[PDB]
Amino acid sequence: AELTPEVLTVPLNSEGKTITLTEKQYLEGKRLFQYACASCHVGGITKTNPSLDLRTETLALATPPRDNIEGLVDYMKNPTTYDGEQEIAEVHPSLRSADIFPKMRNLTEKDLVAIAGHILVEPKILGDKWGGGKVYY
Protein backbone atom coordinates (compact mmCIF):
# COMPACT_ATOMS: atom_id res chain seq x y z
CA ALA A 1 0.00 0.00 0.00
CA GLU A 2 2.75 2.55 0.95
CA LEU A 3 5.78 0.32 0.39
CA THR A 4 4.66 0.07 -3.25
CA PRO A 5 6.07 -2.08 -6.08
CA GLU A 6 8.07 0.55 -8.02
CA VAL A 7 9.04 2.51 -4.93
CA LEU A 8 10.65 -0.84 -4.20
CA THR A 9 11.97 -0.87 -7.78
CA VAL A 10 15.53 0.36 -8.27
CA PRO A 11 18.33 0.61 -10.80
CA LEU A 12 20.18 -2.64 -11.63
CA ASN A 13 22.81 -1.76 -14.21
CA SER A 14 24.80 1.41 -15.05
CA GLU A 15 22.78 0.90 -18.24
CA GLY A 16 19.25 1.48 -16.94
CA LYS A 17 17.63 -1.93 -16.39
CA THR A 18 15.42 -2.06 -13.24
CA ILE A 19 14.88 -5.13 -11.06
CA THR A 20 11.82 -3.93 -9.13
CA LEU A 21 11.44 -6.24 -6.09
CA THR A 22 9.53 -8.07 -3.34
CA GLU A 23 8.48 -7.59 0.26
CA LYS A 24 10.46 -10.79 0.91
CA GLN A 25 13.81 -9.62 -0.43
CA TYR A 26 13.36 -6.18 1.15
CA LEU A 27 12.92 -7.84 4.53
CA GLU A 28 16.09 -9.93 4.23
CA GLY A 29 17.57 -6.57 3.36
CA LYS A 30 16.70 -5.17 6.76
CA ARG A 31 17.56 -8.43 8.62
CA LEU A 32 20.79 -8.43 6.68
CA PHE A 33 21.89 -4.78 6.72
CA GLN A 34 21.86 -5.00 10.51
CA TYR A 35 23.35 -8.46 10.81
CA ALA A 36 25.87 -7.75 8.04
CA CYS A 37 26.51 -5.08 10.61
CA ALA A 38 25.26 -1.56 11.16
CA SER A 39 27.75 -1.35 14.06
CA CYS A 40 29.82 1.41 12.52
CA HIS A 41 27.31 1.75 9.73
CA VAL A 42 24.07 2.28 11.62
CA GLY A 43 21.41 4.40 9.97
CA GLY A 44 22.86 6.11 6.94
CA ILE A 45 26.32 7.34 7.80
CA THR A 46 29.67 5.71 8.42
CA LYS A 47 31.11 5.77 11.90
CA THR A 48 34.59 4.48 11.03
CA ASN A 49 34.89 7.26 8.44
CA PRO A 50 31.98 9.79 8.57
CA SER A 51 33.16 11.44 5.39
CA LEU A 52 31.51 8.75 3.25
CA ASP A 53 27.78 8.09 3.32
CA LEU A 54 25.48 5.62 1.59
CA ARG A 55 23.15 8.14 -0.06
CA THR A 56 22.13 7.37 -3.61
CA GLU A 57 24.15 10.28 -5.12
CA THR A 58 27.30 9.39 -3.25
CA LEU A 59 27.23 5.88 -4.69
CA ALA A 60 26.82 7.32 -8.20
CA LEU A 61 29.84 9.55 -7.98
CA ALA A 62 31.78 6.55 -6.66
CA THR A 63 34.08 4.66 -9.02
CA PRO A 64 32.97 2.43 -10.56
CA PRO A 65 29.34 3.54 -10.30
CA ARG A 66 28.04 2.02 -7.06
CA ASP A 67 24.36 2.90 -7.32
CA ASN A 68 23.69 -0.26 -9.36
CA ILE A 69 22.00 -3.09 -7.56
CA GLU A 70 25.02 -4.55 -9.29
CA GLY A 71 27.70 -2.19 -8.03
CA LEU A 72 27.27 -2.74 -4.34
CA VAL A 73 27.53 -6.44 -5.14
CA ASP A 74 31.02 -6.20 -6.61
CA TYR A 75 31.92 -4.17 -3.54
CA MET A 76 30.53 -6.56 -0.97
CA LYS A 77 32.30 -9.27 -2.99
CA ASN A 78 35.47 -7.22 -3.38
CA PRO A 79 35.80 -3.72 -1.88
CA THR A 80 37.48 -0.64 -3.33
CA THR A 81 38.04 2.93 -2.08
CA TYR A 82 36.16 5.84 -3.59
CA ASP A 83 39.10 5.81 -5.98
CA GLY A 84 38.45 2.38 -7.28
CA GLU A 85 42.24 2.57 -7.18
CA GLN A 86 43.21 0.08 -4.49
CA GLU A 87 41.23 -2.86 -3.14
CA ILE A 88 40.20 -2.15 0.42
CA ALA A 89 39.38 -5.83 0.98
CA GLU A 90 41.46 -6.30 4.14
CA VAL A 91 39.84 -3.50 6.17
CA HIS A 92 36.27 -3.96 4.89
CA PRO A 93 33.84 -6.87 5.18
CA SER A 94 34.04 -8.72 1.93
CA LEU A 95 33.52 -12.20 0.60
CA ARG A 96 37.00 -11.82 -0.90
CA SER A 97 37.98 -11.60 2.76
CA ALA A 98 35.72 -13.81 4.86
CA ASP A 99 38.40 -15.03 7.30
CA ILE A 100 38.43 -11.54 8.82
CA PHE A 101 34.72 -10.69 9.13
CA PRO A 102 32.81 -13.94 9.97
CA LYS A 103 29.37 -12.44 9.49
CA MET A 104 30.42 -12.15 5.84
CA ARG A 105 30.71 -15.92 5.40
CA ASN A 106 27.07 -17.10 5.56
CA LEU A 107 26.41 -14.44 2.91
CA THR A 108 25.18 -15.49 -0.53
CA GLU A 109 24.30 -13.92 -3.89
CA LYS A 110 20.73 -14.24 -2.66
CA ASP A 111 21.59 -12.61 0.68
CA LEU A 112 23.70 -10.03 -1.12
CA VAL A 113 21.24 -8.95 -3.74
CA ALA A 114 19.01 -8.28 -0.75
CA ILE A 115 21.31 -6.25 1.48
CA ALA A 116 22.02 -4.44 -1.77
CA GLY A 117 18.45 -3.61 -2.72
CA HIS A 118 18.09 -2.44 0.87
CA ILE A 119 20.65 0.30 0.32
CA LEU A 120 19.27 1.71 -2.91
CA VAL A 121 15.73 1.50 -1.51
CA GLU A 122 15.93 3.05 1.97
CA PRO A 123 16.65 6.56 0.66
CA LYS A 124 13.52 6.57 -1.54
CA ILE A 125 11.38 6.52 1.62
CA LEU A 126 13.45 8.09 4.42
CA GLY A 127 14.44 11.07 2.29
CA ASP A 128 17.49 12.86 3.65
CA LYS A 129 17.24 11.01 6.98
CA TRP A 130 19.25 8.40 5.09
CA GLY A 131 22.50 10.25 4.52
CA GLY A 132 22.43 12.58 7.49
CA GLY A 133 22.76 11.66 11.11
CA LYS A 134 22.05 13.31 14.45
CA VAL A 135 21.00 16.49 12.66
CA TYR A 136 18.06 14.93 10.82
CA TYR A 137 17.29 12.22 13.39
Binding site: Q34, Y35, C37, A38, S39, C40, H41, V42, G43, K47, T48, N49, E90, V91, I100, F101, P102, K103, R105, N106, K134, Y137
Partner: protein
Protein backbone atom coordinates in the same frame (compact mmCIF):
# COMPACT_ATOMS: atom_id res chain seq x y z
CA UNK B 1 7.15 -24.00 63.74
CA UNK B 2 3.69 -22.48 63.05
CA UNK B 3 2.76 -18.76 63.22
CA UNK B 4 2.67 -17.68 66.88
CA UNK B 5 6.05 -18.64 68.43
CA UNK B 6 7.49 -17.32 65.17
CA UNK B 7 7.72 -14.19 62.98
CA UNK B 8 5.21 -12.95 60.39
CA UNK B 9 4.97 -14.38 56.88
CA UNK B 10 7.38 -11.93 55.16
CA UNK B 11 9.99 -12.82 57.80
CA UNK B 12 9.16 -16.41 57.06
CA UNK B 13 12.63 -17.91 57.07
CA UNK B 14 13.24 -16.60 60.56
CA UNK B 15 11.25 -19.43 62.17
CA UNK B 16 13.90 -21.66 60.64
CA UNK B 17 16.49 -19.95 62.82
CA UNK B 18 14.69 -21.59 65.73
CA UNK B 19 15.93 -24.78 67.33
CA UNK B 20 18.11 -26.61 64.83
CA UNK B 21 17.33 -25.94 61.23
CA UNK B 22 14.67 -28.37 60.08
CA UNK B 23 16.33 -28.14 56.71
CA UNK B 24 19.85 -27.51 55.74
CA UNK B 25 17.73 -28.42 52.78
CA UNK B 26 16.61 -24.87 52.17
CA UNK B 27 20.17 -23.78 51.47
CA UNK B 28 20.69 -26.91 49.41
CA UNK B 29 17.19 -26.53 48.02
CA UNK B 30 18.29 -23.43 46.12
CA UNK B 31 21.97 -24.35 46.10
CA UNK B 32 20.30 -25.97 43.15
CA UNK B 33 18.48 -23.14 41.40
CA UNK B 34 21.91 -21.56 41.37
CA UNK B 35 23.49 -24.60 39.66
CA UNK B 36 20.35 -25.31 37.66
CA UNK B 37 20.44 -21.72 36.42
CA UNK B 38 23.76 -22.49 34.77
CA UNK B 39 22.02 -25.57 33.39
CA UNK B 40 19.23 -23.54 31.81
CA UNK B 41 21.01 -20.34 30.68
CA UNK B 42 24.08 -22.23 29.53
CA UNK B 43 21.81 -24.44 27.43
CA UNK B 44 19.80 -21.36 26.50
CA UNK B 45 22.98 -19.47 25.58
CA UNK B 46 24.44 -22.04 23.21
CA UNK B 47 20.79 -22.55 22.29
CA UNK B 48 21.12 -19.18 20.58
CA UNK B 49 24.85 -19.04 19.84
CA UNK B 50 26.10 -18.84 16.24
CA UNK B 51 29.83 -19.44 15.72
CA UNK B 52 30.57 -16.47 13.42
CA UNK B 53 28.70 -13.67 15.21
CA UNK B 54 31.09 -12.15 17.82
CA UNK B 55 30.30 -13.91 21.11
CA UNK B 56 29.59 -10.60 22.91
CA UNK B 57 27.30 -9.51 20.08
CA UNK B 58 24.94 -12.36 20.97
CA UNK B 59 23.98 -11.65 24.58
CA UNK B 60 26.39 -14.25 25.88
CA UNK B 61 27.09 -13.76 29.55
CA UNK B 62 27.47 -17.40 30.47
CA UNK B 63 29.23 -18.87 27.42
CA UNK B 64 32.17 -16.45 27.36
CA UNK B 65 33.42 -17.90 30.60
CA UNK B 66 33.88 -21.37 29.25
CA UNK B 67 35.89 -19.88 26.39
CA UNK B 68 38.03 -17.85 28.77
CA UNK B 69 39.01 -21.22 30.30
CA UNK B 70 40.34 -22.58 27.01
CA UNK B 71 37.27 -24.57 26.02
CA UNK B 72 35.87 -24.54 22.50
CA UNK B 73 37.99 -21.67 21.21
CA UNK B 74 41.66 -21.94 20.09
CA UNK B 75 43.14 -19.60 17.38
CA UNK B 76 41.70 -16.10 17.76
CA UNK B 77 38.52 -15.95 19.79
CA UNK B 78 36.94 -18.22 17.16
CA UNK B 79 34.75 -21.03 18.36
CA UNK B 80 35.52 -24.44 16.86
CA UNK B 81 33.67 -26.75 19.27
CA UNK B 82 30.00 -25.90 19.83
CA UNK B 83 30.13 -29.08 21.90
CA UNK B 84 32.13 -28.17 25.06
CA UNK B 85 29.78 -25.31 25.92
CA UNK B 86 26.72 -27.52 25.55
CA UNK B 87 28.42 -30.11 27.70
CA UNK B 88 28.83 -27.90 30.81
CA UNK B 89 25.28 -26.61 30.98
CA UNK B 90 23.78 -30.03 30.24
CA UNK B 91 25.72 -31.40 33.14
CA UNK B 92 25.05 -28.64 35.63
CA UNK B 93 21.41 -28.60 34.78
CA UNK B 94 20.99 -32.26 35.33
CA UNK B 95 23.43 -31.87 38.22
CA UNK B 96 20.91 -29.51 39.85
CA UNK B 97 18.24 -32.16 40.28
CA UNK B 98 20.34 -34.09 42.78
CA UNK B 99 20.99 -30.78 44.53
CA UNK B 100 17.31 -29.91 44.55
CA UNK B 101 16.01 -33.45 44.81
CA UNK B 102 17.72 -33.42 48.21
CA UNK B 103 17.26 -29.96 49.53
CA UNK B 104 13.57 -30.45 48.67
CA UNK B 105 13.59 -33.43 50.98
CA UNK B 106 15.72 -32.22 53.96
CA UNK B 107 13.11 -29.49 54.36
CA UNK B 108 9.89 -31.51 54.70
CA UNK B 109 10.42 -35.27 55.47
CA UNK B 110 13.74 -35.41 57.36
CA UNK B 111 14.67 -34.37 60.92
CA UNK B 112 12.62 -31.25 61.59
CA UNK B 113 15.44 -30.94 64.13
CA UNK B 114 19.07 -31.93 63.39
CA UNK B 115 19.91 -30.27 66.68
CA UNK B 116 18.96 -33.67 68.27
CA UNK B 117 20.16 -36.02 65.52
CA UNK B 118 23.17 -33.75 66.21
CA UNK B 119 26.00 -36.31 66.48
CA UNK B 120 27.69 -35.62 63.13
CA UNK B 121 29.16 -32.20 63.96
CA UNK B 122 25.48 -31.14 64.07
CA UNK B 123 23.60 -28.04 65.02
CA UNK B 124 23.56 -25.00 67.26
CA UNK B 125 25.07 -21.61 66.50
CA UNK B 126 26.38 -20.40 69.85
CA UNK B 127 28.39 -23.66 69.70
CA UNK B 128 31.64 -21.82 68.97
CA UNK B 129 33.42 -24.87 67.62
CA UNK B 130 30.87 -26.64 65.46
CA UNK B 131 31.07 -23.40 63.46
CA UNK B 132 34.83 -23.01 63.46
CA UNK B 133 35.06 -26.59 62.27
CA UNK B 134 32.25 -26.30 59.68
CA UNK B 135 33.57 -23.27 57.79
CA UNK B 136 36.76 -25.23 58.21
CA UNK B 137 35.46 -27.87 55.85
CA UNK B 138 34.30 -25.37 53.28
CA UNK B 139 37.79 -23.89 53.45
CA UNK B 140 39.58 -27.04 52.27
CA UNK B 141 36.59 -27.10 49.87
CA UNK B 142 37.38 -23.89 48.03
CA UNK B 143 41.17 -24.11 47.79
CA UNK B 144 40.29 -27.55 46.46
CA UNK B 145 39.62 -26.30 42.96
CA UNK B 146 41.91 -23.25 43.29
CA UNK B 147 44.06 -26.10 42.12
CA UNK B 148 41.20 -27.50 39.95
CA UNK B 149 41.79 -24.38 37.91
CA UNK B 150 45.57 -24.57 38.15
CA UNK B 151 45.06 -28.04 36.61
CA UNK B 152 42.88 -26.82 33.77
CA UNK B 153 45.52 -24.08 33.53
CA UNK B 154 48.50 -26.42 33.73
CA UNK B 155 47.33 -30.02 33.16
CA UNK B 156 44.08 -30.30 31.14
CA UNK B 157 44.09 -27.69 28.37
CA UNK B 158 45.13 -24.21 29.47
CA UNK B 159 43.18 -20.94 29.28
CA UNK B 160 42.55 -18.22 26.72
CA UNK B 161 45.24 -15.56 26.70
CA UNK B 162 44.75 -12.44 24.58
CA UNK B 163 48.32 -11.39 25.39
CA UNK B 164 49.64 -14.83 24.57
CA UNK B 165 52.37 -14.52 21.85
CA UNK B 166 50.71 -14.91 18.44
CA UNK B 167 47.37 -13.43 19.47
CA UNK B 168 44.36 -14.37 21.54
CA UNK B 169 44.67 -18.13 21.74
CA UNK B 170 44.11 -21.11 24.04
CA UNK B 171 47.44 -21.54 25.82
CA UNK B 172 48.68 -23.67 28.73
CA UNK B 173 50.08 -21.87 31.78
CA UNK B 174 53.50 -23.42 32.06
CA UNK B 175 55.24 -21.34 34.66
CA UNK B 176 52.88 -19.81 37.28
CA UNK B 177 54.23 -17.23 39.72
CA UNK B 178 56.52 -18.05 42.68
CA UNK B 179 57.58 -14.74 44.22
CA UNK B 180 55.16 -13.76 46.99
CA UNK B 181 55.99 -10.07 46.44
CA UNK B 182 54.10 -10.22 43.14
CA UNK B 183 51.13 -12.47 43.86
CA UNK B 184 50.60 -10.74 47.21
CA UNK B 185 51.91 -7.35 46.14
CA UNK B 186 48.71 -6.56 44.33
CA UNK B 187 46.80 -6.11 47.59
CA UNK B 188 49.31 -3.43 48.64
CA UNK B 189 48.94 -1.85 45.20
CA UNK B 190 47.23 1.49 44.58
CA UNK B 191 43.45 1.43 44.70
CA UNK B 192 42.95 4.32 42.30
CA UNK B 193 43.38 5.00 38.59
CA UNK B 194 46.67 3.61 37.35
CA UNK B 195 46.73 0.53 39.57
CA UNK B 196 43.70 -1.25 41.01
CA UNK B 197 44.78 -3.62 43.78
CA UNK B 198 42.86 -6.62 42.44
CA UNK B 199 42.02 -5.68 38.86
CA UNK B 200 45.45 -4.87 37.49
CA UNK B 201 46.61 -8.19 35.99
CA UNK B 202 48.53 -8.39 32.67
CA UNK B 203 48.84 -12.19 32.30
CA UNK B 204 47.65 -15.65 33.37
CA UNK B 205 51.07 -16.55 34.82
CA UNK B 206 50.14 -14.34 37.76
CA UNK B 207 46.49 -15.46 37.81
CA UNK B 208 46.75 -19.21 37.91
CA UNK B 209 50.09 -18.50 39.59
CA UNK B 210 48.25 -16.59 42.28
CA UNK B 211 45.32 -18.98 42.55
CA UNK B 212 47.76 -21.73 43.51
CA UNK B 213 48.93 -19.59 46.39
CA UNK B 214 45.29 -19.13 47.33
CA UNK B 215 44.31 -22.80 47.22
CA UNK B 216 46.95 -23.75 49.76
CA UNK B 217 46.50 -20.52 51.74
CA UNK B 218 42.78 -21.18 51.87
CA UNK B 219 43.12 -24.93 52.58
CA UNK B 220 45.54 -24.09 55.43
CA UNK B 221 42.61 -22.26 56.96
CA UNK B 222 40.07 -25.03 56.81
CA UNK B 223 42.71 -27.38 58.18
CA UNK B 224 43.26 -24.69 60.83
CA UNK B 225 39.81 -23.67 62.15
CA UNK B 226 38.67 -27.28 61.90
CA UNK B 227 41.22 -28.07 64.64
CA UNK B 228 40.86 -25.16 66.99
CA UNK B 229 38.68 -22.83 69.04
CA UNK B 230 38.71 -19.05 68.46
CA UNK B 231 40.66 -16.96 70.95
CA UNK B 232 39.23 -14.74 73.70
CA UNK B 233 39.55 -11.31 72.08
CA UNK B 234 37.58 -12.86 69.23
CA UNK B 235 34.70 -13.97 71.45
CA UNK B 236 34.95 -10.60 73.30
CA UNK B 237 34.69 -8.70 69.99
CA UNK B 238 32.05 -10.34 67.77
CA UNK B 239 28.46 -11.20 68.60
CA UNK B 240 27.65 -14.84 68.10
CA UNK B 241 24.18 -15.66 66.85
CA UNK B 242 22.95 -17.57 63.85
CA UNK B 243 21.70 -14.28 62.42
CA UNK B 244 24.80 -12.32 63.39
CA UNK B 245 26.78 -14.92 61.43
CA UNK B 246 24.79 -14.19 58.28
CA UNK B 247 25.18 -10.54 59.16
CA UNK B 248 28.97 -10.59 58.85
CA UNK B 249 29.29 -13.18 56.18
CA UNK B 250 26.74 -11.28 54.02
CA UNK B 251 28.87 -8.12 53.94
CA UNK B 252 31.74 -10.05 52.42
CA UNK B 253 29.57 -10.50 49.35
CA UNK B 254 28.48 -6.88 49.19
CA UNK B 255 32.11 -5.84 49.09
CA UNK B 256 33.04 -8.72 46.84
CA UNK B 257 30.29 -8.05 44.32
CA UNK B 258 31.50 -4.51 43.92
CA UNK B 259 34.96 -6.00 43.51
CA UNK B 260 33.42 -7.92 40.60
CA UNK B 261 31.37 -5.12 39.07
CA UNK B 262 34.52 -2.99 39.36
CA UNK B 263 36.50 -5.86 37.79
CA UNK B 264 34.32 -6.97 34.87
CA UNK B 265 34.24 -3.38 33.70
CA UNK B 266 37.95 -2.98 33.74
CA UNK B 267 39.96 -6.04 32.70
CA UNK B 268 40.87 -7.34 29.26
CA UNK B 269 42.89 -10.25 30.68
CA UNK B 270 40.34 -12.33 32.60
CA UNK B 271 37.61 -10.85 30.44
CA UNK B 272 39.13 -11.00 26.90
CA UNK B 273 36.57 -8.81 25.07
CA UNK B 274 36.66 -11.39 22.29
CA UNK B 275 34.03 -12.96 24.46
CA UNK B 276 32.92 -9.86 26.35
CA UNK B 277 32.78 -6.44 24.73
CA UNK B 278 35.77 -4.11 24.48
CA UNK B 279 36.29 -2.50 27.89
CA UNK B 280 34.86 0.98 28.35
CA UNK B 281 38.22 2.78 28.21
CA UNK B 282 39.39 0.49 25.42
CA UNK B 283 36.51 1.89 23.41
CA UNK B 284 37.30 5.62 23.55
CA UNK B 285 40.89 4.57 22.88
CA UNK B 286 39.87 2.40 19.98
CA UNK B 287 38.15 5.41 18.46
CA UNK B 288 41.39 7.29 18.79
CA UNK B 289 43.33 4.53 17.08
CA UNK B 290 40.84 4.34 14.21
CA UNK B 291 41.05 8.07 13.42
CA UNK B 292 44.73 8.49 14.09
CA UNK B 293 44.86 6.08 11.22
CA UNK B 294 42.13 7.56 9.07
CA UNK B 295 44.01 10.83 8.67
CA UNK B 296 47.59 9.57 8.88
CA UNK B 297 46.43 7.27 6.13
CA UNK B 298 44.76 10.29 4.55
CA UNK B 299 48.12 12.04 4.58
CA UNK B 300 48.27 13.92 7.86
CA UNK B 301 51.48 14.11 9.92
CA UNK B 302 49.48 13.16 13.05
CA UNK B 303 52.25 13.46 15.60
CA UNK B 304 52.76 17.16 14.90
CA UNK B 305 49.07 18.10 14.47
CA UNK B 306 47.93 20.99 16.67
CA UNK B 307 44.44 20.18 17.90
CA UNK B 308 41.37 22.50 18.33
CA UNK B 309 41.81 22.99 22.07
CA UNK B 310 45.52 23.66 22.02
CA UNK B 311 46.52 20.12 22.71
CA UNK B 312 46.57 18.21 19.47
CA UNK B 313 44.01 15.90 17.92
CA UNK B 314 45.63 12.49 17.40
CA UNK B 315 48.46 12.76 19.95
CA UNK B 316 48.66 14.32 23.39
CA UNK B 317 50.80 14.23 26.54
CA UNK B 318 50.09 12.81 30.05
CA UNK B 319 51.93 13.87 33.23
CA UNK B 320 53.77 10.59 34.23
CA UNK B 321 53.96 8.47 31.06
CA UNK B 322 54.82 11.05 28.36
CA UNK B 323 52.78 9.86 25.31
CA UNK B 324 49.17 8.74 24.64
CA UNK B 325 46.15 9.22 22.36
CA UNK B 326 44.50 12.57 22.89
CA UNK B 327 40.85 13.58 22.83
CA UNK B 328 38.81 13.33 25.98
CA UNK B 329 40.19 9.89 25.53
CA UNK B 330 43.08 10.83 27.81
CA UNK B 331 41.29 9.51 30.90
CA UNK B 332 42.12 6.07 29.57
CA UNK B 333 45.84 6.31 28.83
CA UNK B 334 46.11 3.48 31.37
CA UNK B 335 44.33 1.08 29.03
CA UNK B 336 46.35 -1.88 27.89
CA UNK B 337 45.35 -4.50 25.36
CA UNK B 338 47.22 -6.59 22.79
CA UNK B 339 45.66 -4.64 19.92
CA UNK B 340 47.57 -1.49 20.87
CA UNK B 341 50.68 -2.61 22.69
CA UNK B 342 52.86 -3.36 19.66
CA UNK B 343 52.58 0.32 18.81
CA UNK B 344 54.06 1.15 22.24
CA UNK B 345 57.38 2.71 23.17
CA UNK B 346 59.88 3.44 25.94
CA UNK B 347 58.56 6.97 26.50
CA UNK B 348 55.03 5.89 25.44
CA UNK B 349 53.26 5.74 22.07
CA UNK B 350 56.01 5.83 19.47
CA UNK B 351 55.69 8.26 16.56
CA UNK B 352 58.05 6.19 14.36
CA UNK B 353 56.13 3.03 15.09
CA UNK B 354 52.58 4.40 14.94
CA UNK B 355 53.60 6.02 11.65
CA UNK B 356 54.89 2.92 9.79
CA UNK B 357 54.64 -0.30 11.88
CA UNK B 358 50.94 0.09 12.45
CA UNK B 359 49.58 -2.99 10.70
CA UNK B 360 46.12 -3.85 9.22
CA UNK B 361 45.02 -6.52 11.67
CA UNK B 362 44.78 -3.57 14.04
CA UNK B 363 42.70 -1.03 12.01
CA UNK B 364 39.98 -3.66 11.77
CA UNK B 365 40.04 -4.87 15.39
CA UNK B 366 40.34 -1.19 16.35
CA UNK B 367 37.24 -0.37 14.36
CA UNK B 368 35.24 -3.27 15.82
CA UNK B 369 35.99 -1.94 19.29
CA UNK B 370 35.30 1.61 18.26
CA UNK B 371 31.79 0.52 17.26
CA UNK B 372 30.96 -2.19 19.74
CA UNK B 373 31.20 -0.01 22.83
CA UNK B 374 29.67 -0.51 26.32
CA UNK B 375 26.79 1.89 25.51
CA UNK B 376 23.12 0.96 25.45
CA UNK B 377 19.57 1.36 26.74
CA UNK B 378 17.50 -1.12 28.77
CA UNK B 379 15.54 -1.05 25.57
CA UNK B 380 18.73 -2.77 24.41
CA UNK B 381 19.38 -0.36 21.49
CA UNK B 382 23.14 -0.28 21.63
CA UNK B 383 24.61 3.10 21.06
CA UNK B 384 24.80 6.65 22.20
CA UNK B 385 22.04 7.91 24.39
CA UNK B 386 20.41 9.37 21.29
CA UNK B 387 20.83 6.83 18.48
CA UNK B 388 18.26 5.61 15.98
CA UNK B 389 16.81 2.17 16.48
CA UNK B 390 18.74 -0.25 14.25
CA UNK B 391 22.09 -1.57 15.46
CA UNK B 392 21.52 -2.88 18.92
CA UNK B 393 24.09 -4.47 21.19
CA UNK B 394 24.69 -4.24 24.90
CA UNK B 395 28.09 -5.21 26.21
CA UNK B 396 28.30 -8.21 28.44
CA UNK B 397 30.30 -5.85 30.61
CA UNK B 398 27.37 -3.45 30.82
CA UNK B 399 25.02 -6.06 32.25
CA UNK B 400 27.66 -7.82 34.27
CA UNK B 401 29.24 -4.77 35.92
CA UNK B 402 25.90 -3.01 36.33
CA UNK B 403 23.87 -5.83 37.96
CA UNK B 404 26.44 -6.93 40.50
CA UNK B 405 26.71 -3.37 41.70
CA UNK B 406 22.99 -2.98 42.35
CA UNK B 407 23.00 -6.35 44.02
CA UNK B 408 26.30 -5.90 45.87
CA UNK B 409 24.93 -2.52 46.86
CA UNK B 410 21.68 -3.95 48.13
CA UNK B 411 23.68 -6.54 49.97
CA UNK B 412 25.58 -3.82 51.78
CA UNK B 413 22.07 -2.68 52.77
CA UNK B 414 21.75 -6.20 54.05
CA UNK B 415 24.99 -6.33 55.99
CA UNK B 416 23.39 -3.44 57.81
CA UNK B 417 19.85 -4.59 58.55
CA UNK B 418 21.11 -7.98 59.67
CA UNK B 419 23.82 -6.44 61.88
CA UNK B 420 21.37 -3.82 63.08
CA UNK B 421 18.87 -6.46 64.27
CA UNK B 422 21.53 -8.90 65.50
CA UNK B 423 23.69 -6.48 67.49
CA UNK B 424 20.33 -5.97 69.15
CA UNK B 425 19.83 -9.45 70.64
CA UNK B 426 23.17 -8.72 72.34
CA UNK B 427 21.21 -6.75 74.94
CA UNK B 428 17.65 -7.81 74.16
CA UNK B 429 16.17 -4.49 73.02
CA UNK B 430 15.78 -5.96 69.50
CA UNK B 431 12.12 -6.78 70.09
CA UNK B 432 11.66 -3.13 71.09
CA UNK B 433 12.26 -0.80 74.03
CA UNK B 434 10.82 -1.91 77.40
CA UNK B 435 8.07 0.52 78.54
CA UNK B 436 9.21 0.53 82.18
CA UNK B 437 12.99 0.02 81.93
CA UNK B 438 14.44 2.22 79.14
CA UNK B 439 18.05 3.51 79.57
CA UNK B 440 17.09 7.00 78.40
CA UNK B 441 14.06 7.82 80.62
CA UNK B 442 16.63 7.32 83.37
CA UNK B 443 19.79 9.21 82.33
CA UNK B 444 21.61 12.55 82.88
CA UNK B 445 19.79 15.01 80.54
CA UNK B 446 22.33 16.19 77.95
CA UNK B 447 21.26 19.76 78.95
Amino acid sequence: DQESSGFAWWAGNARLINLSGKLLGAHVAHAGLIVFWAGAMTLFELAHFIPEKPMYEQGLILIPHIATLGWGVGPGGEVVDTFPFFVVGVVHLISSAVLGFGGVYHAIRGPETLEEYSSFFGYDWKDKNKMTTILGFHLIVLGIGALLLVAKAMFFGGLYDTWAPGGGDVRVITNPTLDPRVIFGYLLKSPFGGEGWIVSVNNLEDVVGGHIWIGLICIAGGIWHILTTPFGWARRAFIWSGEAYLSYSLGALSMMGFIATCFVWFNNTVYPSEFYGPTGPEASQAQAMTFLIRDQKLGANVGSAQGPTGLGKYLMRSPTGEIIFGGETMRFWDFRGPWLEPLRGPNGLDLNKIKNDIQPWQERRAAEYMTHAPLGSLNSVGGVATEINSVNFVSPRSWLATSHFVLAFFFLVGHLWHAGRARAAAAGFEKGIDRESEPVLSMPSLD
